[PDB]
Symmetry: C3
Subunit: 115 residues, 3 copies
């Protein structure tokens, strides 16, 4: 079972790292907990609760992966002395799409619920 | 950053153009059918996910290309891995639409 | 070009096979994924519930694949360069963790409403 505790350790190291270093990530965590609270407090069916939570967590996932990519790029540029933000742009685009997905999700779901 | 990368992906990646077309089409079609909110959301999200994953994969490909002009086993592995991730997102999207529309 | 699709699919399967052979976590999570997918196709639930149960778990697959790609990039860099903070690897590990947590939460909320 050791590999599991090692991996989870790496995961918490990463999460704490992202929380301390990235402001947008802190905002996204706030967004997740708020999402759960709102979804559970509102009298809402299971699929919709799930969707309201998942759509927001997806943002966190994509943000983390993006941050990983940014880190790789930064190591490169540190040793490379050449910079092109192609990758960073693409990642940020991905995160944007995730956010738009969450807003659409919440719009449709909450609009239906309060109809 | 954002619109820069999106414009980049549209101009360069063909699969991304096809995915954008697929996304907007999916939006229209999801809004046309008389389905519930959860269904609509799933129909849209499933397609948007493909776009997201394709974008991340494209970022990875960019990094790999920047690292070295020469091809290496690990660099190739990375690309292949990213291509695999995109594949799964598509299958999921397909499965999503199938379960939903068959039920409808 | 219609052939482009089959080329990209070839790359894709090459990557799936690569991930399965080299990455163990991908194998185990793959077992849990396939199990979950099978179970979802036999549960007496609505389309939305089934799609949710399946997709939530396939997300784990996708994120693990991306994490593996990133790890491959870091491993590539580590041959040329000597020091590695492994911060990127940690971030990816975090992403996978969040994906899994999402899957579990999804299954709990869904099945506790279903069976409950």
């Amino acid at each position: 079972f050791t590999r599991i505790i090692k991996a989870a350790g790496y995961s918490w190291k990463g999460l704490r790292a992202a929380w301390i270093n990235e402001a947008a990530f802190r905002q996204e965590g706030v967004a997740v907990l708020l999402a759960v609270v709102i979804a559970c407090w509102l009298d809402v069916d299971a699929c919709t609760r799930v969707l309201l939570i998942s759509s927001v967590m997806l943002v966190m996932i994509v943000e983390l992966l993006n941050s990983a990519i940014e880190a790789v790029v930064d190591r490169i540029g540190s040793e490379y002395h050449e910079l092109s933000g192609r990758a960073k742009d693409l990642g940020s685009a991905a995160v944007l799409i995730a956010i738009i997905d969450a807003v659409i999700t919440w719009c449709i779901l909450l609009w239906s619920h309060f109809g």
